[PDB]
Each structure stands twice: as C-alpha cells, then as structure tokens.
Paper text:
Here, we characterize the O-methyltransferases BelI and CysG, which catalyze the initial step of β-lactone formation. Employing techniques such as crystallography, computational analysis, mutagenesis, and activity assays, we identified a His-His-Asp (HHD) motif in the active sites of the two enzymes, which is crucial for binding a catalytically active calcium ion. As expected, BelI as well as CysGΔN16 adopt the class I methyltransferase Rossmann fold, characterized by a core domain of a seven-stranded β-sheet flanked by α-helices. The HHD-motif enables regiospecific C1-carboxy group methylation of their respective malic substrates.
Due to the high crystallization tendency of CysGΔN16, subsequent mutagenesis experiments were focused on this variant. Therefore, we conducted structure-based mutagenesis by introducing non-conservative alanine residues in the HHD motif to further explore the metal-binding site. In contrast, the CysGfl-H122A variant remained active across diverse metal ions but was inactivated by EDTA. Therefore, His122 is involved in metal stabilization without affecting the interaction between protein and substrate.
Numbering used by the authors: 17 to 229
Write the structure that this text describes.
C-alpha cells in the first residue's frame, strides 16, 4: 500500500503524525473546523478523522492527481471538502480552529513560507493552532550529512525498495528546507504568541504555533 511506503520513507512516522493529531486534539474542540494545506492523499487528514470524528476537514492541494487519492480515501465522509489551490493563492476564508500541513511547505521559497505563516494566522480563530510535520535542514552542512545518514539508516532498516528510495531522494532535490528553530521563530514573527517543537527525529519534526495561547 501507499501508506506502508510513507512509513518506510519517513523516520518516526507514527511519532510525528501522531504528535500532530495529539496537539490538535488538546488545542481544539471535537467540532473543530480544520484546513489541511498540501493534503496530498490526505494521510494526516485521515489520522485527524480517526481522533476527531465530528471535525469538519477542508483538504487543499495544487495537484488534482494527489487529491484524486484523497477523494477515494474519504469516499463516504460527508464532513470532508476538497479544494484545488496553491499555498500562494488566497487561503479559504476563516475562521479555522486548526490549520495543519505535512511535508508540503518546504517546497516554497523562504519569503513565501514567512508570508504563508502570516496569512495562516489571519484565518485562525483566537487560540487557534497551526501544526506542521516538516522535512527540516540541519543548522550546519556537517550536521546535515549526519541528518542524511540517519534518514538513510531508517530507509534501509525499513527494507525500502531501491527504486522508491531513488524517487524519494529525487523529490527532496526540489525541496527548500530550513532548520526547525528558524521556521519556529517565523511563527513568532507572524504574530503567534507561542511556538514549540513537539517531536523530532533528525531531518523530520512536528512543530506548532498558537494564535493567542
Ligand atoms: N505550492 C503548493 N501549493 C499546494 N500544494 C502544494 C504546493 N507545493 C507542493 N504541494 C503539494 O504538497 C504535497 C507534498 S507530499 C505530502 C502529502 C501529504 N500531506 C502527506 O503527508 O502524505 C503534494 O501533494 C504536492 O502536490
């Protein structure tokens, strides 16, 4: 399955996606309105639905091909809507209790990331939460080599098909990651009153900002 390959490619998948679901559930009500930016096949959205059966999910992505898989995943779910939109396009009108994203925002230029965080806060209710599960750069080129070693170590320990890891490395060449503490400070710059790294496995981290808390 697609879901098994993602666990193979992503170190501490269960910790990082689990941490995103847990922090949302401890920050918003059961009936929360949640925006999922770069939802893809809707993997984080599925994890949220499992925890929050009464939550309204809006799944957003630039790729109709990716959303086709999200449509199938959520075939019979009447509290899930799907919007075709770029992160750089106007966000859907607030208010949202939570805006979430997994492995998407790293594709934007740094200035576009900072602008996006500001635009996200504007569509969040007071006390609202932004959560990102993100590929993060090491703070030095030497530590980046160690980050890469640990990613490789997980992929080989997971018995990952060679051709799928090759495709994975190729996709990462088109990412523009930065270190977690830099993008956490960008949340503070954007006007989020608290921001924190909840969980981290070297190259992959779950962080959140709160709009008043
Ligand atoms: N500028 C942009 N605007 C919207 N979606 C974007 C984007 N750049 C990349 N994406 C989307 O971001 C996704 C990255 S793959 C991650 C998919 C899913 N969130 C998961 O965790 O499994 C892809 O679906 C890609 O189409």
């Amino acid at each position: 399955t697609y879901d098994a390959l993602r666990r193979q490619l992503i170190p501490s998948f269960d910790l990082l996606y689990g941490s995103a679901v847990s922090v949302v559930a401890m920050s918003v009500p059961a009936t929360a309105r949640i925006l999922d930016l770069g939802a893809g096949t809707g993997l984080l959205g599925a994890a949220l639905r499992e925890r929050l059966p009464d939550a309204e999910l809006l799944l957003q992505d630039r790729s109709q091909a990716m959303l086709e898989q999200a449509r199938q995943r959520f075939a019979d779910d009447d509290q899930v809507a799907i919007r075709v939109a770029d992160h750089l396009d106007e966000l859907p009108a607030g208010p949202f209790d939570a805006v979430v994203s997994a492995l998407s925002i790293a594709h934007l230029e740094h200035q576009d990331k900072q602008d996006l965080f500001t635009r996200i806060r504007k569509i969040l209710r007071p006390g609202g939460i932004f959560v990102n599960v993100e590929q993060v750069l090491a703070p030095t080129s030497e530590l980046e080599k160690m980050y890469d070693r640990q990613h490789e170590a997980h992929v080989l320990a997971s018995d990952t098909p060679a051709e799928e890891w090759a495709a994975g490395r190729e996709r990462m060449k088109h990412d523009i990651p930065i270190d977690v503490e830099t993008q956490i400070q960008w949340l503070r710059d954007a006007g989020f009153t608290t921001a924190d790294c909840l969980a981290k496995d070297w190259r992959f981290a779950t962080y959140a900002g709160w709009n008043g808390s």
